Design a protein around this ligand. Structure first.
Ligand SMILES: [Zn+2]
Ligand SMILES: [Zn+2]
Lengths: 50, 138, 116, 65, 76, 115, 46, 58, 99, 103
RNA sequence: GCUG
């Protein structure tokens, strides 16, 4: 959260509320959600050798 | 992370589309610091500028709203938020042009948006002038 | 701010929106020579009924589509409205019924909301 | 000034990784390999640790204490 | 009758502007306005129905003049 | 060809949808169907065009501006040939006869041939 | 209404009354900073 | 800055505003978006009459 | 639906026969419409650190909370004080001292 | 007041109707458009966001014949709910099965 | 002095 040096103090109270990601990104529950279609490589001609 | 593409038509002439989630996480978050300074001088006549304390409301034992953030020395206090038409230094000056008679000359925060006070600097020059500088944060 | 011809000042119908900037359709960038790179523009609110009518009838954008000089149109399409239209009207483009409808349905907003 | 708590684009928490990354660099670990050990696979997350400049330590030298 | 039959753009702007000021000052409205709260919108509706009580006096440069009714002039 | 508001042939360029000059569909509508009809079309295109581009995608990358093999060979040949010809012209002015173009000094002529 | 100010170099709290020169005991510094407000301040995390 | 040019030929006017401009293609070509902060300041004097009395009350 | 891999904090699964529009909705809902608990208001007393209070408030909001969202309820507009059902309170007090 | 139905004309022809859905975005509209465009009766279905600022989607359904257009829209919402119910059950069963094999 |  922070870095302090001698004689420095942080005192605070935090209130946590339910929210959706649309209002703010802080409420989003997933680091990333993504979908990829499955690859289907097809060799049209047989490939042999080097 | 820039994607070079044409998106939404709001980017026709140099305009660029930003991401809301990136801005929320802190992309482009910036601080603006502004000054406010006041000088209290000792005149040729043996008279001086002074800072009066906060003017209390007698009916409610709290300062009037225009004086809400003043500390007991009449100078605004670090940490508190200033709003428009609020005084920072409750300065009064002699209208000498038999006892002194003072006109109020308060330093006031003009600004469309609210600012926070980070520190108040008090120092004095050799001529017995008192210098006050406020650092303000947005 | 710099006005070289009469089309640099025109009258528009206001619509109130939350964000701080002034906003207009980019087809009107060519008369104002505006480029959205931190450009600023001025606004004046005529305080009289007679000043509304002279602003609306004489200085309206729909009455000023052509420059007085050579009689050529200045309010017209610009970048990403010419490129999108070009790529749309090329011979290689074919759409099925689902994507035809979803491009056309974009126009159904405002006064076109009632048309079949 | 201080390591950002969450990656700007993806949103992964990258605040926890700063102390480990500095330690891995103190050892023989390469910058690419150190980022790999922390688990920052995507480029968006890697740049946050790689491009971060730690000014909090320098600024604190001038702090009141 | 030598002057152009068509109403000029300048003439339309002034006739609407005076009519709107008159309507905004509580003048009678001859168009049975339906849900209109703006004097300029009401004035434009009156011009379309050709019911505006104003006569345009066109002054020739010599000093002679010809008066054309707003209804008589063609509106483009 | 735009016959009865149907586009029968041709793509739409700057010269047909843009601000440059006449033959612009908007101008034709203006005079033929009045100012209001012309304005409506401009508004409609502005809505339609971004949606197609945004969902088809247009991008520019170092690949687009990267010189292909054909140009890379051609340039070498063209540059070498051009440099050699210029040297010869330079040789003539230095030591000999360069046909002086009408109305010009020899140095002026060399500049023109070289350019 | 007691007022305590902290000096720039010594960092020692000094009580200065009105019309008193801004010098700090334990040092010669003439720059003094007022202490932070005791009042609670609310910040929206957004 | 003289009276002829500074104060007569060209002069400062009220009911005026200035801001940065940015694009919006979803507006019609005859429209301009005005922010609420300018709209609350820039007022127009509407004369009260039979057509607008119940509108201006609200 | 086939679960290719599941480990704490990561799930990989394959949906076969679903359409892109339905699938995109699930991704969009997960990113924006699934509720969670996060710090909204920070009350600050005695913050003497170099970090600015506004920056410190933003950092605290970003930090994730392990509380289960389904148990709690949405706070009504205003209603700052809150209730046991609608809010969680966390107190951070740290003072730095020489060893 | 989430759904306001605006008929195309003063005549209130039922076949063409625009449904304005409040507090909505592409997530409901795109999914609903696919479900209601798989109906043979709907000739044209499209959604448009009036402005990025306002969270409302205008969905226009034009039916092939005399269908009121409420009937195609309602059927599409019902189909989307059934597709969601099936996916949730299939996903939960698959997740439980995977954990059991891991154990 | 710089932005427009
Ligand atoms: Zn990342
Ligand atoms: Zn000291």
């Amino acid at each position: 959260i922070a870095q302090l040096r001698p004689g420095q103090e942080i005192d605070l109270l935090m209130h946590c509320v339910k929210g959706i990601g649309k209002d703010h990104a802080k409420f989003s529950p997933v680091a990333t959600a993504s979908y990829r279609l499955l690859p289907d490589i097809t060799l049209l001609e047989p490939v042999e050798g080097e | 992370t820039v994607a070079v593409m044409s998106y939404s038509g709001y980017d026709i002439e140099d305009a660029l589309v930003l991401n809301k989630a990136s801005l929320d996480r802190g992309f482009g978050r910036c601080l603006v610091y502004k000054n406010a300074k006041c000088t209290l001088k000792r005149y040729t006549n043996q008279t001086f500028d002074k800072v009066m304390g906060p003017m209390l409301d007698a009916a409610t034992r709290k300062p009037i709203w225009r004086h809400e953030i003043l500390d007991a020395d009449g100078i605004c206090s670090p940490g508190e938020k200033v709003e428009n038409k609020q005084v920072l230094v409750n300065k009064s000056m002699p209208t000498v042009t038999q006892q002194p008679q003072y006109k109020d000359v308060p330093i006031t925060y003009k600004g469309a948006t609210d600012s926070y006070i980070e520190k108040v600097m008090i120092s004095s020059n050799a001529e017995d002038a008192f210098l006050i500088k406020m650092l303000l944060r947005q | 701010q710099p006005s070289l011809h009469k089309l640099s000042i025109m009258a528009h119908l206001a619509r109130v929106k939350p964000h701080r900037t002034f906003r207009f359709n980019e087809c009107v960038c060519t008369p104002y020579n505006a480029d959205f790179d931190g450009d600023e523009m001025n606004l004046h609110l005529p305080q009289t009924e007679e000043a509304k009518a002279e602003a609306l009838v004489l200085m309206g954008t729909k009455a000023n589509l052509v420059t007085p000089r050579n009689g050529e149109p200045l309010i017209a399409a610009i970048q990403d409205f010419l490129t999108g239209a070009y790529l749309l009207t090329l011979k290689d483009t074919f759409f099925d019924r689902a994507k035809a409808c979803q491009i056309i349905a974009s126009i159904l907003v405002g006064k076109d909301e009632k048309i079949k | 000034m201080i390591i950002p708590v969450r990656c700007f684009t993806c949103g992964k928490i990258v605040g926890n990784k700063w102390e480990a990354y500095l330690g891995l660099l103190q050892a023989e670990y390469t910058e690419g390999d150190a980022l790999d050990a922390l688990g920052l696979k995507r480029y968006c997350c890697r740049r946050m640790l790689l491009a971060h400049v730690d000014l909090i330590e320098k600024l604190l030298n001038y702090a009141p204490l | 009758r030598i002057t152009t039959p068509y109403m000029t753009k300048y003439e339309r702007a002034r006739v609407l502007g005076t009519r709107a000021l008159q309507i905004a000052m509580c003048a009678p409205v001859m168009v049975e306005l339906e849900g209109e709260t703006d004097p300029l919108l009401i004035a434009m509706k009156e011009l379309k129905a050709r019911k505006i009580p104003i006569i345009i006096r066109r002054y020739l440069p010599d000093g002679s003049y010809e008066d054309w009714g707003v209804d008589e002039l063609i509106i483009t | 060809t735009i016959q009865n508001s149907e586009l029968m042939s041709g793509s739409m360029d700057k010269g047909t949808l843009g601000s440059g000059s006449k033959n612009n569909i908007f101008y034709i509508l203006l005079r033929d169907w009045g100012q209001n009809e012309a304005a409506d079309a401009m508004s409609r295109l502005a809505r339609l065009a971004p949606v197609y581009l945004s969902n088809r995608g247009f991008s520019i990358g170092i690949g687009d501006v990267t010189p292909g093999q054909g140009l890379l060979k051609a340039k070498y040949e063209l540059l070498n040939a051009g440099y050699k010809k210029c040297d010869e012209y330079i040789e003539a002015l230095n030591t000999g006869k360069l046909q002086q173009q009408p109305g010009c000094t020899a140095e002026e002529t060399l500049e023109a041939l070289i350019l | 209404q007691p007022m305590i100010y902290i000096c720039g170099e010594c960092h020692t709290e000094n009580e200065i009354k009105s019309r008193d020169p801004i010098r700090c005991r334990e040092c010669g510094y003439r720059i003094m900073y007022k202490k932070r407000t005791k009042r609670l301040v609310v910040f929206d995390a957004r | 800055q003289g009276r002829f040019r500074g104060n007569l030929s060209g002069k400062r006017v009220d009911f005026s505003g200035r801001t940065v401009i940015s694009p919006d293609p979803n507006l019609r070509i005859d429209e301009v978006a005005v922010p609420v902060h300018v709209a609350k300041i820039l007022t127009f004097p509407e004369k009260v009459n039979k057509a607008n009395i119940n509108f201006l009350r609200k | 639906v086939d679960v290719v891999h599941m480990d704490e904090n990561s799930l990989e699964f394959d949906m076969v026969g679903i359409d892109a529009a339905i699938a995109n909705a699930f991704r969009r809902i997960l990113l924006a419409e699934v509720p969670t608990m996060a710090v909204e208001k920070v009350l600050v007393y005695n913050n003497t650190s170099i970090v600015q209070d506004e920056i410190l408030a933003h950092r605290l909001g970003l930090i994730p909370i392990h509380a289960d969202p389904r148990l709690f309820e949405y706070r009504n507009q205003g209603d700052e004080e809150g209730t046991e059902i609608d809010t969680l309170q966390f107190r951070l007090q740290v003072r730095c001292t020489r060893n | 007041k989430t759904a306001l139905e605006m008929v195309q004309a003063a005549g209130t022809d039922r076949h063409c109707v625009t449904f304005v859905l409040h507090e909505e975005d592409h997530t409901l509209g795109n999914s609903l458009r696919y479900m209601i465009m798989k109906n043979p009766e709907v000739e044209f279905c499209g959604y448009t966001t009036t402005h990025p600022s306002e969270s409302k989607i205008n969905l226009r359904i034009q039916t092939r014949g005399t269908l009121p257009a409420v009937e195609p829209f309602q059927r599409g919402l019902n189909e989307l709910m059934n597709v969601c119910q099936h996916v949730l059950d299939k996903f939960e069963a698959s997740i439980k099965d995977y954990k059991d094999q891991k154990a």
